[PDB]
Curated annotation (Swiss-Prot):
Organism of this sequence: Homo sapiens (Human)
Gene Ontology biological process terms in this record: fatty acid transport
Function noted in UniProt: Intracellular transport of retinol.
Protein name, per record: Retinoid-binding protein 7
SUPFAM superfamilies for the chain: Lipocalins
Localization of this protein: Cytoplasm
InterPro entries on file: Calycin, Fatty_acid-bd, ILBP, Lipocln_cytosolic_FA-bd_dom
Gene it is expressed from: RBP7
Main location as per UniProt: cytoplasm
Domain of life the protein comes from: Eukaryota
Comment on protein domains: Forms a beta-barrel structure that accommodates hydrophobic ligands in its interior.
Entry keywords, A to Z: Cytoplasm, Retinol-binding, Transport, Vitamin A
C-alpha cells in the first residue's frame, strides 16, 4: 500500500478527450470538461478511502473501502451504473468497474510527491498527474 492522501491539483492531462468519448459524453460537456483543472482530495484511513473530485462543471465524490464491491451510479457522469472494486496492485490503487463499458476503471499511485492517475475505458487511457497543493 501507499499513502495517497492530500489535496491535489491537476498538473498534466493526456487523452482525456479519448477517455470521455469512450464513455459517450456529449460534445458540449467534453468541450467544457477538457478546459478544467479539477482538484482531487484523497482522505485515506487504512484501506478506507473517500475521494473528492472538485471542478467548475461538476463536483464528484466516491467513498469506498479497499476490497469492497460497491455500485457506482454515474448519473452525474455518463449516467451508466457500475459495480466497482478497488484493490492494491502492489502500491498502485486500482479500481475495476464492471458494467456496460468494457475494461473501464482507474489507477492511482504516487512517486515522490506527485500523484498519478490513469483512467481507462475500452481502449482509451487518460493519463493525469497532480501536484500536492
Amino acid at each position: 500500500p501507499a499513502d495517497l492522501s492530500g489535496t491535489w491539483t491537476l498538473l498534466s492531462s493526456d487523452n482525456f478527450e479519448g477517455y470521455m468519448l469512450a464513455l459517450g459524453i456529449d460534445f458540449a460537456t467534453r468541450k467544457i470538461a477538457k478546459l478544467l483543472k479539477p482538484q482531487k482530495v484523497i482522505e485515506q484511513n487504512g484501506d478506507s478511502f473517500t475521494i473528492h473530485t472538485n471542478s467548475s462543471l461538476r463536483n464528484y465524490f466516491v467513498k469506498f473501502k479497499v476490497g469492497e464491491e460497491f455500485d457506482e451510479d454515474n448519473r452525474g457522469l455518463d449516467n451508466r451504473k457500475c459495480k466497482s472494486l478497488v484493490i492494491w496492485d502492489n502500491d498502485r490503487l486500482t479500481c475495476i468497474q464492471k458494467g456496460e463499458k468494457k475494461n473501464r476503471g482507474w489507477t492511482h499511485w504516487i512517486e515522490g510527491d506527485k500523484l498519478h492517475l490513469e483512467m481507462f475505458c475500452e481502449g482509451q487511457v487518460c493519463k493525469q498527474t497532480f501536484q500536492r497543493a
